[PDB]
């Protein structure tokens, strides 16, 4: 709750919210690919 939002999320906010957006879209695509790969096996 505390010191997790303090030392982990305040510094990473400018990146997780604005810079890494398409990175998150890509992680969605990657997760879908990995799900389909592990499924066809």
């Amino acid at each position: 709750l505390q010191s997790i939002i303090k030392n982990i999320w305040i510094p990473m906010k400018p990146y997780y919210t604005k810079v890494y957006q398409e990175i998150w879209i890509g992680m969605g695509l990657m997760g879908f690919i990995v799900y389909k790969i592990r499924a066809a096996d």
Binding site: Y15, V19, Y20, Q21, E22, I23, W24, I25, G26, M27, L29, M30, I33, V34
Partner: protein, 223 residues
């Protein structure tokens, strides 16, 4: 028997791959001081030099990714270097981790080029001064080229580390097998092994820098 070094490790039944993968950052201590020990001095100099190398060629929109790219290279380099110690499991030899490092970043940069920049993004699928009877065909080429960009990335690491490690191990076998036959032959094979280990150090650092550089080039072409 031979690929045993690339099987997911377990200790007492637990997945030690977690510890192995999370350990590298423990080797980059940080401090608020102005004048600190030799370790942090050298590491900050290295990160300064790496950021100067990787990020200078970008405009500001790309330079926003400086944290991500320098962290990428610092993670991969220490992972590969820690893979060289004896009896160690190198998580970069796994296709899983490398695909998960490649597909996110590359997809993110291609989408970033596709959200803004959209005209130039669809235009770069065609080289500029291409003559007319090749404008359609070439597009397919570029298209499939793009579609192969991420997988290539992943493989270019997963193979190059994996192969590398196998090689050393094999020569290891060789020298052991010749330890009971010809002692000078054992020594010469051990010399081959030493040269190969030096090559492996260099190729670990180079593969880290290459993964980073190619993600950087995709970023630059899509910002």
């Amino acid at each position: 028997n031979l690929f045993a070094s690339f099987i997911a490790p377990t200790i007492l039944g637990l997945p030690a791959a977690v510890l192995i993968i999370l350990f590298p950052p423990l080797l980059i201590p940080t401090s608020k001081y102005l004048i600190n020990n030799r370790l942090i001095t050298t590491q900050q100099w290295l990160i300064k030099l790496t950021s100067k190398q990787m990020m200078t060629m970008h405009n500001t929109k790309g330079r926003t990714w400086s944290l991500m790219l320098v962290s990428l290279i610092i993670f991969i380099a220490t992972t590969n270097l820690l893979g060289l110690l004896p009896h160690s499991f190198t998580p970069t030899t796994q296709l899983s981790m490398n695909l998960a490092m490649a597909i996110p970043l590359w997809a993110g940069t291609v989408i970033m080029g596709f959200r803004s920049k959209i005209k130039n993004a669809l235009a770069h699928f065609l080289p500029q001064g291409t003559p007319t009877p090749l404008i359609p065909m070439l597009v397919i080429i570029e298209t499939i080229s793009l579609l192969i960009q991420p997988m290539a990335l992943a493989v270019r690491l997963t193979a190059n580390i994996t192969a590398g490690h196998l090689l050393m191990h094999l020569i290891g076998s060789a020298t052991l097998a010749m330890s009971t036959i010809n002692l000078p032959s054992t020594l010469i094979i051990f010399t081959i092994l030493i040269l190969l280990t030096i090559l492996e150090i260099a190729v670990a650092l180079i593969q880290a820098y290459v993964f980073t550089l190619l993600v950087s080039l995709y970023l630059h072409d899509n910002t």
